[PDB]
C-alpha cells in the first residue's frame, strides 16, 4: 500500500544517461534536477517526518578521462552521516500525500559548514535515499527508499560539457 514514486523520472534519466553531476561548494549548492516524490499509502490522520540522506555507491572514486567516466582511484574516507529533515516535518500523512514532496532547499557541500547541508566527497558517486518516520511511534519504525534514477557524481566543477549544457537547457 505504501508507494513512493519519483516525479520527473524521465528528466533524471536524461542526466543519468550522460552520468549526472552535482556541484558541491564551500557554502552549499542546491541540486538540479530537484528531487521530488509522490507518496501514497500513509495514514492521512497520522503524522510523519520525511528525511533525506545520500548513500555512497562505490568503493572507489571516479575520474573523467577522454570524455568517459572511469574508476579514478581509491576512495577517500567516507563522508560524515548527514541527514536533511524536510522543512514541512512533522506533518500529517494528508499533507505529504496531497502534493509531491520536494527537496528544493537541500544543499550539497564539500565542507562541514553552516546549515543542514550535506557533506559529500568530490569525484565520488552518491544516490539520494528518503526515509519516512512516524511521530509518536514506540517502535520508531522507519521506511527507507532509494532512487537509482537520481544517482550522480559530486564535483567541484562540471566535467562533461553535455551535463553543463543540459543543466542550462532544462533549468
Ligand atoms: C489504518 C492505517 C494504518 C497505517 C497506515 N500506514 C502505515 C504504513 C506506513 N506507515 C509508517 C509507519 C511508521 C513509520 C513509517 C511509516 Cl511509512 C504507516 O503509518 C495506513 C492506514 C490506512 N490509511 O488505512
mmCIF file of C-alpha atoms and ligand atoms in Angstrom:
data_model
loop_
_atom_site.group_PDB
_atom_site.id
_atom_site.type_symbol
_atom_site.label_atom_id
_atom_site.label_comp_id
_atom_site.label_asym_id
_atom_site.label_seq_id
_atom_site.Cartn_x
_atom_site.Cartn_y
_atom_site.Cartn_z
ATOM 1 C CA UNK A 1 0.000 0.000 0.000
ATOM 2 C CA UNK A 2 2.818 2.462 0.782
ATOM 3 C CA UNK A 3 4.088 3.841 -2.540
ATOM 4 C CA UNK A 4 6.839 6.432 -3.050
ATOM 5 C CA UNK A 5 7.298 7.376 -6.705
ATOM 6 C CA UNK A 6 9.956 9.531 -8.328
ATOM 7 C CA UNK A 7 8.480 12.570 -10.072
ATOM 8 C CA UNK A 8 10.002 13.628 -13.401
ATOM 9 C CA UNK A 9 11.818 10.318 -13.716
ATOM 10 C CA UNK A 10 12.226 10.923 -17.453
ATOM 11 C CA UNK A 11 14.251 14.098 -16.832
ATOM 12 C CA UNK A 12 16.501 12.371 -14.281
ATOM 13 C CA UNK A 13 17.089 9.596 -16.812
ATOM 14 C CA UNK A 14 18.382 12.157 -19.333
ATOM 15 C CA UNK A 15 21.033 13.245 -16.833
ATOM 16 C CA UNK A 16 21.738 9.671 -15.758
ATOM 17 C CA UNK A 17 22.298 8.667 -19.395
ATOM 18 C CA UNK A 18 25.179 11.175 -19.528
ATOM 19 C CA UNK A 19 26.278 10.338 -15.952
ATOM 20 C CA UNK A 20 24.786 13.016 -13.705
ATOM 21 C CA UNK A 21 26.964 15.505 -11.825
ATOM 22 C CA UNK A 22 26.121 17.750 -8.861
ATOM 23 C CA UNK A 23 28.259 20.719 -7.834
ATOM 24 C CA UNK A 24 29.424 20.906 -4.202
ATOM 25 C CA UNK A 25 30.704 24.229 -2.836
ATOM 26 C CA UNK A 26 32.084 25.630 0.397
ATOM 27 C CA UNK A 27 28.761 27.323 1.135
ATOM 28 C CA UNK A 28 26.436 24.719 -0.378
ATOM 29 C CA UNK A 29 24.630 24.275 -3.671
ATOM 30 C CA UNK A 30 21.071 23.207 -4.479
ATOM 31 C CA UNK A 31 20.521 20.264 -6.795
ATOM 32 C CA UNK A 32 19.177 20.196 -10.325
ATOM 33 C CA UNK A 33 17.047 18.314 -11.055
ATOM 34 C CA UNK A 34 15.278 18.824 -7.731
ATOM 35 C CA UNK A 35 14.354 15.556 -6.022
ATOM 36 C CA UNK A 36 10.548 15.248 -5.811
ATOM 37 C CA UNK A 37 8.407 12.230 -4.919
ATOM 38 C CA UNK A 38 4.740 11.368 -4.766
ATOM 39 C CA UNK A 39 3.576 9.413 -1.719
ATOM 40 C CA UNK A 40 0.506 7.216 -1.215
ATOM 41 C CA UNK A 41 -0.471 4.721 1.471
ATOM 42 C CA UNK A 42 0.368 6.706 4.575
ATOM 43 C CA UNK A 43 -2.242 7.133 7.274
ATOM 44 C CA UNK A 44 -3.767 10.567 6.441
ATOM 45 C CA UNK A 45 -4.543 11.096 10.141
ATOM 46 C CA UNK A 46 -1.067 10.192 11.422
ATOM 47 C CA UNK A 47 1.968 12.490 11.468
ATOM 48 C CA UNK A 48 5.305 11.739 9.788
ATOM 49 C CA UNK A 49 8.692 13.314 9.210
ATOM 50 C CA UNK A 50 10.490 12.994 5.873
ATOM 51 C CA UNK A 51 14.284 12.664 5.927
ATOM 52 C CA UNK A 52 16.881 12.589 3.142
ATOM 53 C CA UNK A 53 20.456 11.336 3.023
ATOM 54 C CA UNK A 54 22.964 10.350 0.353
ATOM 55 C CA UNK A 55 24.477 6.847 0.089
ATOM 56 C CA UNK A 56 27.917 6.269 -1.421
ATOM 57 C CA UNK A 57 27.663 3.892 -4.378
ATOM 58 C CA UNK A 58 31.224 2.562 -4.814
ATOM 59 C CA UNK A 59 34.447 1.561 -3.073
ATOM 60 C CA UNK A 60 36.417 3.850 -5.409
ATOM 61 C CA UNK A 61 36.295 7.350 -6.783
ATOM 62 C CA UNK A 62 35.839 8.362 -10.406
ATOM 63 C CA UNK A 63 37.648 10.463 -12.995
ATOM 64 C CA UNK A 64 36.578 11.973 -16.314
ATOM 65 C CA UNK A 65 39.203 10.923 -18.879
ATOM 66 C CA UNK A 66 38.848 11.345 -22.657
ATOM 67 C CA UNK A 67 35.124 12.077 -22.382
ATOM 68 C CA UNK A 68 34.459 8.986 -20.260
ATOM 69 C CA UNK A 69 33.949 8.465 -16.544
ATOM 70 C CA UNK A 70 36.365 5.785 -15.345
ATOM 71 C CA UNK A 71 37.420 4.479 -11.924
ATOM 72 C CA UNK A 72 39.912 7.050 -10.729
ATOM 73 C CA UNK A 73 41.494 5.806 -7.546
ATOM 74 C CA UNK A 74 40.851 4.511 -4.084
ATOM 75 C CA UNK A 75 38.025 6.339 -2.298
ATOM 76 C CA UNK A 76 38.564 8.955 0.330
ATOM 77 C CA UNK A 77 37.308 8.209 3.854
ATOM 78 C CA UNK A 78 33.518 8.080 3.916
ATOM 79 C CA UNK A 79 31.668 11.376 4.288
ATOM 80 C CA UNK A 80 30.007 12.108 7.653
ATOM 81 C CA UNK A 81 26.441 10.932 8.036
ATOM 82 C CA UNK A 82 24.385 13.973 7.065
ATOM 83 C CA UNK A 83 20.588 13.788 7.178
ATOM 84 C CA UNK A 84 18.309 16.523 5.845
ATOM 85 C CA UNK A 85 14.936 16.970 7.523
ATOM 86 C CA UNK A 86 12.272 18.086 5.100
ATOM 87 C CA UNK A 87 11.160 21.511 6.391
ATOM 88 C CA UNK A 88 7.466 20.507 6.344
ATOM 89 C CA UNK A 89 8.236 17.968 9.106
ATOM 90 C CA UNK A 90 6.413 16.824 11.211
ATOM 91 C CA UNK A 91 3.150 16.763 9.237
ATOM 92 C CA UNK A 92 0.004 14.748 8.600
ATOM 93 C CA UNK A 93 0.030 11.968 6.071
ATOM 94 C CA UNK A 94 -2.657 14.088 4.413
ATOM 95 C CA UNK A 95 -0.082 16.853 3.925
ATOM 96 C CA UNK A 96 2.559 14.580 2.413
ATOM 97 C CA UNK A 97 0.070 12.889 0.076
ATOM 98 C CA UNK A 98 -1.851 15.872 -1.318
ATOM 99 C CA UNK A 99 1.077 17.050 -3.450
ATOM 100 C CA UNK A 100 4.577 15.865 -4.392
ATOM 101 C CA UNK A 101 7.244 16.212 -1.704
ATOM 102 C CA UNK A 102 10.028 18.466 -2.990
ATOM 103 C CA UNK A 103 13.523 18.722 -1.531
ATOM 104 C CA UNK A 104 14.228 22.045 -3.226
ATOM 105 C CA UNK A 105 16.168 23.615 -0.327
ATOM 106 C CA UNK A 106 18.796 20.907 0.321
ATOM 107 C CA UNK A 107 22.384 21.998 -0.443
ATOM 108 C CA UNK A 108 25.430 19.827 -1.180
ATOM 109 C CA UNK A 109 28.813 20.936 0.186
ATOM 110 C CA UNK A 110 32.440 19.808 0.337
ATOM 111 C CA UNK A 111 32.931 21.377 3.792
ATOM 112 C CA UNK A 112 31.298 20.922 7.161
ATOM 113 C CA UNK A 113 29.977 24.489 7.199
ATOM 114 C CA UNK A 114 26.891 26.350 8.388
ATOM 115 C CA UNK A 115 23.497 24.831 7.654
ATOM 116 C CA UNK A 116 21.817 21.475 7.454
ATOM 117 C CA UNK A 117 23.909 20.954 4.350
ATOM 118 C CA UNK A 118 25.009 17.543 3.052
ATOM 119 C CA UNK A 119 28.755 16.812 3.116
ATOM 120 C CA UNK A 120 29.939 14.906 0.020
ATOM 121 C CA UNK A 121 33.369 13.954 -1.348
ATOM 122 C CA UNK A 122 34.152 15.330 -4.801
ATOM 123 C CA UNK A 123 34.539 12.732 -7.579
ATOM 124 C CA UNK A 124 32.537 10.131 -5.631
ATOM 125 C CA UNK A 125 29.148 8.708 -6.660
ATOM 126 C CA UNK A 126 26.070 9.007 -4.432
ATOM 127 C CA UNK A 127 22.372 8.194 -4.547
ATOM 128 C CA UNK A 128 19.579 10.045 -2.689
ATOM 129 C CA UNK A 129 17.597 7.985 -0.195
ATOM 130 C CA UNK A 130 14.390 9.075 1.547
ATOM 131 C CA UNK A 131 13.198 7.940 4.979
ATOM 132 C CA UNK A 132 9.704 8.276 6.458
ATOM 133 C CA UNK A 133 9.302 8.216 10.243
ATOM 134 C CA UNK A 134 6.012 8.282 12.160
ATOM 135 C CA UNK A 135 5.754 10.575 15.134
ATOM 136 C CA UNK A 136 4.780 9.060 18.472
ATOM 137 C CA UNK A 137 5.645 5.533 17.300
ATOM 138 C CA UNK A 138 7.053 3.434 20.198
ATOM 139 C CA UNK A 139 8.606 1.090 17.610
ATOM 140 C CA UNK A 140 10.352 4.058 15.946
ATOM 141 C CA UNK A 141 9.569 2.480 12.595
ATOM 142 C CA UNK A 142 11.393 3.942 9.598
ATOM 143 C CA UNK A 143 10.878 3.209 5.915
ATOM 144 C CA UNK A 144 13.794 3.768 3.515
ATOM 145 C CA UNK A 145 13.540 4.301 -0.250
ATOM 146 C CA UNK A 146 16.316 4.514 -2.848
ATOM 147 C CA UNK A 147 16.111 6.215 -6.231
ATOM 148 C CA UNK A 148 18.503 4.704 -8.794
ATOM 149 C CA UNK A 149 17.442 7.280 -11.429
ATOM 150 C CA UNK A 150 18.910 10.071 -9.308
ATOM 151 C CA UNK A 151 22.491 8.764 -8.923
ATOM 152 C CA UNK A 152 25.155 11.404 -9.508
ATOM 153 C CA UNK A 153 28.835 12.186 -9.084
ATOM 154 C CA UNK A 154 29.692 15.100 -6.804
ATOM 155 C CA UNK A 155 32.072 17.553 -8.500
ATOM 156 C CA UNK A 156 33.654 20.909 -7.733
ATOM 157 C CA UNK A 157 33.037 21.703 -11.423
ATOM 158 C CA UNK A 158 31.220 20.017 -14.295
ATOM 159 C CA UNK A 159 33.411 17.589 -16.185
ATOM 160 C CA UNK A 160 31.060 16.629 -19.030
ATOM 161 C CA UNK A 161 30.164 19.586 -21.270
ATOM 162 C CA UNK A 162 26.915 17.765 -22.160
ATOM 163 C CA UNK A 163 25.954 17.944 -18.477
ATOM 164 C CA UNK A 164 26.834 21.637 -18.399
ATOM 165 C CA UNK A 165 24.626 22.206 -21.457
ATOM 166 C CA UNK A 166 21.769 20.035 -20.168
ATOM 167 C CA UNK A 167 21.633 21.874 -16.835
ATOM 168 C CA UNK A 168 21.235 25.142 -18.760
ATOM 169 C CA UNK A 169 18.666 23.691 -21.160
ATOM 170 C CA UNK A 170 16.224 22.144 -18.670
ATOM 171 C CA UNK A 171 16.765 24.769 -15.954
HETATM 172 C C1 LIG B 1 -5.118 2.441 9.170
HETATM 173 C C2 LIG B 1 -3.757 2.709 8.575
HETATM 174 C C3 LIG B 1 -2.624 2.480 9.352
HETATM 175 C C4 LIG B 1 -1.353 2.711 8.859
HETATM 176 C C5 LIG B 1 -1.182 3.194 7.557
HETATM 177 N N1 LIG B 1 0.097 3.418 7.061
HETATM 178 C C6 LIG B 1 1.264 2.799 7.672
HETATM 179 C C7 LIG B 1 2.207 2.173 6.651
HETATM 180 C C8 LIG B 1 3.326 3.187 6.531
HETATM 181 N N2 LIG B 1 3.394 3.708 7.901
HETATM 182 C C9 LIG B 1 4.590 4.023 8.635
HETATM 183 C C10 LIG B 1 4.609 3.762 9.997
HETATM 184 C C11 LIG B 1 5.731 4.060 10.749
HETATM 185 C C12 LIG B 1 6.831 4.642 10.160
HETATM 186 C C13 LIG B 1 6.825 4.928 8.816
HETATM 187 C C14 LIG B 1 5.709 4.618 8.052
HETATM 188 CL CL1 LIG B 1 5.764 4.999 6.367
HETATM 189 C C15 LIG B 1 2.140 3.798 8.424
HETATM 190 O O1 LIG B 1 1.801 4.510 9.353
HETATM 191 C C16 LIG B 1 -2.308 3.427 6.766
HETATM 192 C C17 LIG B 1 -3.585 3.176 7.264
HETATM 193 C C18 LIG B 1 -4.773 3.451 6.389
HETATM 194 N N3 LIG B 1 -4.854 4.643 5.813
HETATM 195 O O2 LIG B 1 -5.624 2.570 6.177
#
